[PDB]
Ligand SMILES: [Zn+2]
Ligand SMILES: [Zn+2]
Ligand SMILES: [Zn+2]
Ligand SMILES: [Zn+2]
Ligand SMILES: [Zn+2]
Ligand SMILES: [Zn+2]
Ligand SMILES: [Zn+2]
């Protein structure tokens with residue numbers, strides 16, 4: 032068994048506090064909670080007021096106690112008590128199973144949300160890369176055109192140089208005369 | 209159930225005293241015997257010294273007690289307790305059956321002794337009857353013998369009378385003389 | 386521990402037994418004779434059993450493997466329910482035996498008290514016959530004493546007659562002597 | 565409520581199931597297939613089963629008549645022993661199911677943490693690619709400015725050379741004027 036206090040859920044050995052609302056708590060939490068005049072079950076918040084609604088029970092009873100607790104009772108009474116005890120145990124097992132299923136469901140939900148956040152950033156990261164790739168291609172095309180303009184300007188510069196040199200020779204020839 | 213005190217053997221309801229030696233007693237006998245520091249079980253004379261060797265148990269437990277006495281225990285423990293309680297009940301039933309068989313045997317023994325005495329008194333009186341009948345037969349034999357003697361005496365009487373008459377006639381004849 | 390519910394059998398049941406939905410159990414011989422028919426009549430209470438499960442041929446000392454597997458896999462609620470019904474059958478059989486024994490004890494006590502009345506009355510009767518014989522013996526004694534007294538008186542009369550005859554003889558003899 | 569002990573089935577068991585002496589239960593389909601073999605091996609624990617009562621096809625929803633009659637006639641000690649073994653089987657199935665669930669939860673937690681590590685590494689890769697694009701964008705801007713500024717400077721030198729050509733042309737015209 033495990034403590035039905037949500038923050039403890041520790042394996043129960045020795046002394047435990049059992050409630051009429053089918054809950055069981057460890058010795059420390061049971062003593063602290065079920066010794067107060069206002070007694071509220073920490074699990075289901077049920078208002079327990081009766082004397083037998085709360086019992087401090089040993090989970091490993093001695094041989095003599097087991098041999099004498101139900102001695103003298105009719106078989107119907109013994110069967111009824113055994114039925115109620117096993118009903119308590121099955122309820123505790125069912126609650127533990129539901130708690131584990133809930134935790135597994137929470138883990139699956141966390142994984143799906145994590146995948147959603149990651150995929151949202153995937154699509155964001157791909158768009159930034161594609162946008163930068165498009166900008167780089169546009170700028171490289173502009174650089175290609177400007178280099179072509181550079182080739183034309185250098186050709187005009189060399190052509191002007193040769194025409195300038197031709198005028199140099201004509202000027203020098205007329206100056207010498 | 210019945211009180212294991214021999215002189216009580218009353219149906220047990222409400223409160224009873226149960227022993228580790230598989231015996232149960234009524235409230236009055238249980239309290240009286242189990243208030244002694246030197247307390248010995250009246251049924252089997254077992255030396256009881258332990259705490260759980262003596263329990264005052266309610267034979268009609270409340271619903272809340274039945275739902276909480278074994279609440280929290282493992283199914284194996286509950287099975288063990290139920291097994292020992294049913295073992296106690298079967299032992300008590302078996303002892304009651306043996307007691308009833310013992311009472312039937314005692315009744316059979318009393319009947320056989322009753323026939324035994326009755327037959328003896330018949331035989332004694334039958335011999336008395338036979339002795340009286342034998343005496344009566346002897347009386348009848350004596351009666352017949354005396355009747356025969358009476359007849360003989362009557363014959364002697366008539367013979368004497370006739371002789372007396374004949375001598376009377378002779379006397380009368382000599383009277384004429 | 387159990388007994389055949391047939392009234393004239395009441396034999397201890399071991400090995401195979403036949404259990405009925407009528408809360409009755411019989412030995413193998415009674416069950417085989419009666420519980421092989423499609424319509425089943427309970428030998429104890431004559432109830433008409435017709436269902437398949439109304440009659441079961443069960444071993445009373447089951448093997449360990451059978452005990453471990455017959456209810457294996459069933460939920461605890463089902464197992465408790467089956468145990469409760471099985472114990473209900475056992476208590477019903479125990480109650481029947483207990484009531485039968487108590488009724489027999491009551492019958493024995495009534496027979497015992499009737500025998501006490503019968504024996505005492507027969508003893509009182511036998512005392513009457515003893516008194517009857519005693520009265521007869523007294524009557525015989527009285528009659529015999531009466532006859533003895535009658536004989537004694539007649540004998541006395543006879544002897545007196547004898548003395549009278551002797552006296553007459555003497556008178557006659559003296560009378561003869563005179564003449 | 566129970567589940568087939570075959571690992572690839574684990575289906576909720578209702579109606580008929582196959583129970584083993586080694587404390588395992590399987591669905592009708594897997595039980596029929598496995599336990600029709602002469603070499604029949606329990607798929608859960610690989611135990612070699614050979615006995616008769618090691619294999620039972622049990623109904624998980626027994627009729628009321630069956631529940632009232634299956635254990636009828638047995639002693640209370642026998643019924644208690646059967647109940648103990650049946651509850652022992654149920655607790656074993658619950659314990660094995662609990663261990664399986666705990667193992668799967670541990671595996672799920674480990675896989676979840678591994679996916680978080682993998683996702684962060686993939687994000688780290690994309691951040692590296694983003695920095696690579698940042699570096700090339702800076703390179704394009706540096707190339708753009710350097711090339712255009714050098715291109716503009718060469719154009720300015722061309723215009724200065726053209727104006728110097730005009731100056732020489734004017735001086736040549738003046739030299740022509742004098743002659
Ligand atoms: Zn706690
Ligand atoms: Zn509660
Ligand atoms: Zn008493
Ligand atoms: Zn005792
Ligand atoms: Zn019947
Ligand atoms: Zn019979
Ligand atoms: Zn399966």
Ligand SMILES: [Zn+2]
Pocket residue numbers: 584586587588606607608609610611
């Ligand atoms: Zn197995």
